[PDB]
Symmetry: D2
Subunit: 116 residues, 4 copies
């Protein structure tokens, strides 16, 4: 039950996307994106350990998912350069955020599940 989990699924093959480059940033006071965390999509597609409740701080985030590498490798030219999910986090306090991403070569979907 990580405070930020990014479950990633592939709709073309019908299986979880495996080995997708993911990067988490953070908006700073200078309106500049600074690195915050990184990881690799497992066999099941889920992610863990990107941030902890102490490190996870109020502000604006951005989750970057590298669709270019994933579909370039598998031989289908993808449209989107990557995926980005920007959201005001911990606005009302500590909560559990789940970012779900359903990928296609030329489309993707995003969902937030807030446990509160």
């Amino acid at each position: 039950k990580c405070p930020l989990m990014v479950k990633v699924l592939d709709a073309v093959r019908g299986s979880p996307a495996i080995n997708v480059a993911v990067h988490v940033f953070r908006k700073a006071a200078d309106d500049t994106w600074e690195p915050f965390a990184s990881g690799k999509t497992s066999e099941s597609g889920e992610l863990h350990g990107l941030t902890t409740e102490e490190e996870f701080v109020e502000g604006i985030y951005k989750v970057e998912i590298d669709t270019k590498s994933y579909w370039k490798a598998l031989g289908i030219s993808p449209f989107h350069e990557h995926a980005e999910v920007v959201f005001t986090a911990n606005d009302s306090g500590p909560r559990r955020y789940t970012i779900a991403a359903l990928l296609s070569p030329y489309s993707y979907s995003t969902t937030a599940v807030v446990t509160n």
Copy 2:
């Protein structure tokens, strides 16, 4: 200008899903689905010339989209046999309805928007 519209798009190819079969029914009191309308999806991925406002009634409807025939032709083995949307129609009055379909080999999404003519 048409009351019910169904739009279908292909997610893997990033294009409208062509030549996709669609069928429409009307719910009956005895829980029997009666053939209502059926057509071939246009090159734009949208249905044209389907139904008229007089044909609509306060009864339930259901629209079926044949995804499996679509994926067989292109050569990808699909998961879904077909897609079905069941919705109570004209509870208030004669309005325009639009059903969106986003097709994938192993998924699809559907959305509904209503309009008042």
Copy 3:
């Protein structure tokens, strides 16, 4: 685990859809949807224990999700009567199937992930 899992989520509340009734129909040789199993979605929005691996057989199935009962409980006017997904199962070997549903008052999405264990 279970050969068939159905997961239901709510878009607007960012929460799993709670207290949603589901019904599973297995097709029969008479082209009739014989009842197969039914369940109640937990607070996690998921459900298990529909059918054992032995109960599953090659054929065509159907999962029906009660959307209006969920919206009537919260009080928004539904568009969709129910959500129905139809797929051939165990076509070659005893693969595992998962059906996910993302619910909004006037839209829903369904995705299926298939694994060979």
Copy 4:
């Protein structure tokens, strides 16, 4: 109309009206230069924000101001905005259109690309 942005409201079941749309373009200094801006009509679509001559090969970014739209309608949303980053005109001239299905706490985007 090299680029179009269709924006639909799931809860209301109607095209979203008056959402702020902004378009950026990658620079050699890895900087986003504001390409254009617009406002969505009652149909939920945008037209004339860019021209074919102005639209050239590169990396673009389309941002949709969902934060104001759902706050205006009175429901607190999750996403600060929607970002659709994608390389363009890599293989030559083609018409690009972006569709966004919005809900408070969820959204999906699908691009349909036409060669002519």
